[PDB]
Design a protein around this ligand. Structure first.
Ligand SMILES: CC(C)Cc1ccc([C@@H](C)C(=O)O)cc1
Ligand SMILES: [Zn+2]
Length: 258
């Protein structure tokens, strides 16, 4: 499998190997703020990260992942639209070559500079590989990034990127607190969707926060110095690793707020 984000292997090609790319609940989507409806049945969202155990940071050739110990209920997402308990396994970002693009979700067609995904899996399915085979297997918290002030809680990530420049590189990344990446407000939109990269499985409850976080131009510039390629291969900067918005089809986006 040779998928990526270039002209010859990018999102417009993925359907040939992954036909679900044209499916009924694909992600990301545009969030029309005038059509999304407040849902008073949504319970309060519960982000419990105080015992999170980060382990490692990895350049996988498509993004960089910060991985967590998910062998116990240490860092969990509950509530909101969710039934049951979802364990944090990793976070990563999608970002652009310029500040005017980079997010996967859009808000009234606005693109943000980047988007953070905190990925969690439903503990009722026992392991992550089983969970992705279920319609309610994953819960992903999506957080928009805009360029302005620096985000102090992001700097420890930015400063290790030099050590994982190329595909397949990893570095120890213990004692990182993901609570430092959240906005003040947990107001959100939610809808059923999919992974936004191959294999594009339709297994995700998306929870997209309304409030973006601010990062500095210097912080996002360091994202853009990473490489898609491996060491000793021609340099391809890791930029524009985002899938565009997909048809909403027979789905409603619900708001947690008035
Ligand atoms: C091998 C696959 C399962 C890895 C993967 C994890 C999470 C995502 C989505 C939810 C995302 O956050 O972009 C996409 C791919
Ligand atoms: Zn993602």
């Amino acid at each position: 499998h040779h998928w990526g984000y270039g002209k010859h292997n990018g999102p417009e090609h993925w359907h040939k190997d992954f036909p679900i790319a044209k499916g009924e609940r694909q992600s990301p989507v545009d969030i029309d703020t005038h059509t999304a409806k407040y849902d008073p049945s949504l319970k309060p969202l519960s982000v419990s990260y105080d015992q999170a155990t980060s382990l490692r940071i990895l350049n996988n050739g498509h993004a960089f992942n910060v991985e967590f110990d998910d062998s116990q209920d240490k860092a969990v997402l509950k509530g909101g639209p969710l039934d049951g308990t979802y364990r944090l396994i990793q976070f990563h970002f999608h970002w652009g070559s310029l500040d005017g693009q980079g997010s996967e979700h859009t808000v009234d067609k606005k693109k943000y500079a980047a988007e953070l995904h905190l990925v969690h899996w439903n503990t009722k399915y026992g392991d992550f590989g089983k969970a992705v085979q279920q319609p309610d297997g994953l819960a992903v918290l999506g957080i928009f990034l805009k360029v302005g002030s620096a985000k102090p809680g992001l700097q420890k990530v930015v400063d290790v990127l030099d050590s994982i420049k190329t595909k397949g590189k990893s570095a120890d990344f213990t004692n990182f607190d993901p609570r430092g990446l959240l906005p003040e407000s947990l107001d959100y939109w939610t809808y059923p969707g999919s992974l936004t990269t191959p294999p594009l499985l339709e297994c995700v409850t998306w929870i997209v926060l309304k409030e973006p976080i601010s990062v500095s131009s210097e912080q996002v510039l360091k994202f853009r110095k990473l490489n898609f390629n491996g060491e000793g291969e021609p340099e391809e900067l890791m930029v524009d690793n985002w899938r565009p918005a997909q048809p909403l089809k027979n789905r409603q986006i619900k708001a947690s707020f008035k």
